[PDB]
């Protein structure tokens, strides 16, 4: 009725997962289905606690739009990818009506909008490039990315696969994309380590996360190119089922938070960086 199944995914600082048996402080309860073993379908819901920028947005929406929720962490993939014409990840949970909405660092793009509705964006994102300070690269259009074997040694650059960034590169730059896959990074933390130790020259990824990591990088050695330039500007959105009756109220509430100054508080709390 008024009690909604909501899916999220850990990605600091937008969603941060901690252990608990009562969640305290600025945290909200969230469950994670953990398998017993790999020869079974049996699992157990572990009770954990969630906080972060997108959790504070969900709290505000819950209070303002007036709903309650049971928050859970996706276990079938990550943000969302269509595999053999079937959506997985947070998008999949919404498409297949296991969640009423998805809340987190979820990028709005065209193909996802064909299967879910999105709220208005509320965090600016897109595709940025993170490098060591001083690296001479113009952008995604740089020939070092577009025609990497024109250079000896070639530029080493990768992304974390299966999200909105890899989808966009695969669609727009086929040669770059097929070159890139050998530099696939399992996650953001691995990629930052590769950058700092000189095993990677560039890390192409979600603009808002790179902006966050650049702002908190030790010694401010790692930067986004073009003073934080973003290709294919978009935003994080709340994903809802197609035709959701909650979309209009969520949109108006987000726009109210913006207009009344409430979003600045969340940005200052979660998104500021020393660099």
């Amino acid at each position: 009725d008024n009690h909604l199944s909501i899916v999220t995914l850990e990605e600091a600082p937008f969603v941060i997962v901690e252990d608990i048996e009562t969640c305290v402080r600025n945290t909200v309860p969230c469950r994670k289905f953990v398998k017993i073993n790999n020869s079974t379908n049996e699992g157990m819901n572990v009770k954990k606690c969630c906080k972060g920028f997108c959790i504070d947005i969900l709290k505000k929406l819950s209070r303002t739009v007036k709903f309650t929720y049971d928050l859970y962490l996706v276990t079938n993939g990550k943000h969302g990818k269509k595999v053999n014409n079937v959506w997985n990840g947070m998008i999949g949970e919404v498409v297949y009506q296991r969640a009423v909405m998805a809340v987190g660092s979820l990028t709005i793009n065209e193909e996802r909008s064909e299967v879910v509705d999105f709220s208005v964006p509320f965090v600016e994102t897109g595709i940025s490039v993170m490098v060591s300070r001083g690296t001479q690269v113009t952008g995604l259009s740089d020939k070092k990315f577009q025609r990497p074997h024109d250079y000896s040694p070639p530029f080493r650059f990768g992304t974390v696969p299966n999200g909105s960034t890899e989808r966009n590169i695969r669609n727009n730059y086929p040669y770059m994309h097929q070159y890139m896959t050998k530099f696939n990074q399992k996650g953001v933390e691995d990629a930052l380590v590769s950058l700092k130790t000189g095993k990677l020259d560039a890390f192409i990824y979600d603009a808002a996360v790179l902006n966050y990591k650049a702002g908190r990088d030790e010694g401010c050695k790692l930067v986004t190119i073009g003073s934080g330039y973003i290709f294919a500007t978009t935003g994080y959105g709340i994903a809802l089922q197609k035709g959701s009756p909650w979309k209009r109220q969520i949109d108006l509430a987000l726009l109210q938070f913006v207009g009344d100054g409430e979003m600045e508080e969340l940005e200052t709390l979660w998104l500021t960086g020393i660099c």
Binding site: I108, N109, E110, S113, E114, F118, V120, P121, E124, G126, N168, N171, N172, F231, A232, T233, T234, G235, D251, L252, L255, Q256, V258, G259, D260, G261
Partner: protein
């Protein structure tokens, strides 16, 4: 056949007189390609409507949407020259009032998405992400939105925005900015171009407005400067009535255009050079 309403606002919408034969002069972009122009009707006090020439970022976007969604259109300039605010009873002026009254079917302009308008119309996903900044004459020293000459104002330093715009409402709605709103209420201008010119002529000391516009003005006019960065993020969307059958494909097309580089091309053609 869709009635498009827009508004004069360089570099998103240029408005020029037609030639003596009713056609629009052949011109070429910074990249060497021809400038796509459309005839747009509008006023030049009575509002005598006459055909004129429209082009720029928003007209290129309209042409793209029309070609990709298969609709025809007629463009006109908003009769009262305003973007649109809601002023016992309440009424919408500007492009908002024209879209709600049926004088237009779609708003294609640098139209800011806010809660007030979204209550009454449907916005596309944003076709441009930007924000608010401050334009001053070169030599004027203010730090930004928190400068004492703005937060503790006097008649020695005059600042303003455009009447019946989203920015006017931004200052009206937040009590934390009431001291500024009461200063600006006495000095707000009828259009952005009049405010920009007033800054150039040292009759307005600071103009608070959309950064996509102000930064373009500063890139072209070397005696104008912005105060730095954005104190508030905002975005432009296409506006349609809530029952429009075109709304979902409009929004999908905007996303496709961000994703395949089309919006970036427009940005290089019209905004950054």
């Amino acid at each position: 056949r869709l009635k498009i309403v827009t508004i004069h606002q360089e570099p998103f919408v240029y408005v020029k007189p037609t030639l003596s034969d009713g056609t629009c002069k052949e011109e070429f972009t910074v990249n060497g390609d021809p400038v796509k122009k459309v005839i747009c009707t509008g006023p030049n006090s009575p509002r005598h409507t006459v055909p004129q020439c429209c082009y720029g970022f928003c007209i290129d976007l309209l042409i793209k949407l029309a070609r990709t969604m298969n609709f025809t259109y007629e463009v006109h300039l908003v009769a009262d020259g305003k973007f649109g605010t809601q002023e016992n009873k309440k009424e919408w002026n500007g492009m908002m009032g024209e879209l709600l009254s049926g004088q237009a079917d779609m708003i294609v302009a640098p139209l800011t998405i806010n809660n007030e308008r979204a209550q009454y119309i449907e916005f596309s996903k944003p076709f441009k992400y930007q924000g608010l900044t401050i334009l001053v004459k070169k030599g004027t020293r203010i730090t930004g939105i928190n400068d004492p000459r703005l937060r503790n104002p006097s008649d020695k330093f005059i600042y303003a925005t455009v009447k019946q715009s989203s920015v006017d409402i931004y200052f009206r709605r937040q009590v934390e900015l009431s001291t500024m709103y009461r200063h600006m209420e006495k000095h707000n201008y009828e259009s952005a171009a009049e405010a920009i010119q007033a800054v150039r002529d040292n009759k307005l000391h600071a103009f608070i407005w959309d950064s996509a516009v102000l930064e373009f003005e500063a890139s072209q006019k070397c005696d104008l400067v912005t105060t730095g960065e954005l104190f508030f993020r905002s975005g432009f969307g296409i506006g349609m009535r809530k029952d429009s059958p075109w709304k979902q494909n409009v929004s999908l097309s905007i996303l496709k255009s961000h994703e395949n580089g089309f919006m970036e091309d427009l940005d290089k053609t019209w905004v950054r050079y």
